[PDB]
């Protein structure tokens with residue numbers, strides 16, 4: 626997260642860190658046994674890390690649970706990042722409390738102008754690299770489909786939305802992908818892609834979660 630703020634320990638209780646020997650992606654807990662992430666976060670040997678603040682120190686609220694199954698969206702295209710969504714089943718159910726909690730799925734799609742919360746352990750610099758240890762947050766609005774399409778000609782599908790600031794300076798970044806975009810307590814987006822970070826007219830691009838609720842519910846109900 627570039628130009629964000631320190632969330633505060635366990636203040637984003639649904640935020641998970643996907644670890645394969647190191648943090649490589651964010652995720653969102655949607656029930657005690659399932660995490661929602663980006664399909665580009667797919668890999669073998671994922672350990673889901675819940676209740677994290679500092680991802681480099683055991684602070685006492687973590688739950689480390691290996692993934693038993695990963696389900697990439699059947700229509701994910703890694704070249705266009707269309708349908709950039711994946712489900713991860715936990716080997717054991719997470720113990721839910723105030724610090725480790727599921728995030729509700731949307732009942733409807735959030736509009737442009739809706740204020741959301743984006744969070745993650747991604748790079749905090751727009752030029753250069755600095756990975757934070759603690760969870761970073763960014764309050765950002767959803768951008769109109771027209772401004773999103775104008776920023777990224779020929780790249781925005783009906784399964785994507787932009788959020789952030791066209792003036793730049795505040796964006797998600799390397800390491801935040803897979804993580805949440807939560808608006809009014811609903812998971813509306815997954816950190817997906819961009820062109821650099823916090824650059825003018827290049828806001829972050831997010832997977833449009835409301836388009837996947839039926840697939841998520843059906844998948845959970847059968848796996």
Ligand SMILES: COc1cc(C(=O)N2C[C@@H](n3cc(C4CC4)nn3)C[C@H]2C(=O)N[C@H]2CCCC[C@@H]2c2ccccc2)ccc1CN
Pocket residue numbers: 648649650665666703706747796797798799800801802816817818819820821822823828829830
């Ligand atoms: C460039 O813009 C952004 C970027 C991000 C952001 O985090 N990204 C962009 C994501 N991505 C993947 C792909 C296609 C090729 C499959 N296109 N974009 C991956 C992630 C990232 O680089 N993660 C590093 C951080 C270090 C360890 C390895 C991780 C990693 C690399 C690859 C796959 C998973 C994890 C998130 C938000 C924005 C918006 N500014």
Ligand SMILES: [Ca+2]
Pocket residue numbers: 677678679680681682683684687
């Ligand atoms: Ca920790």
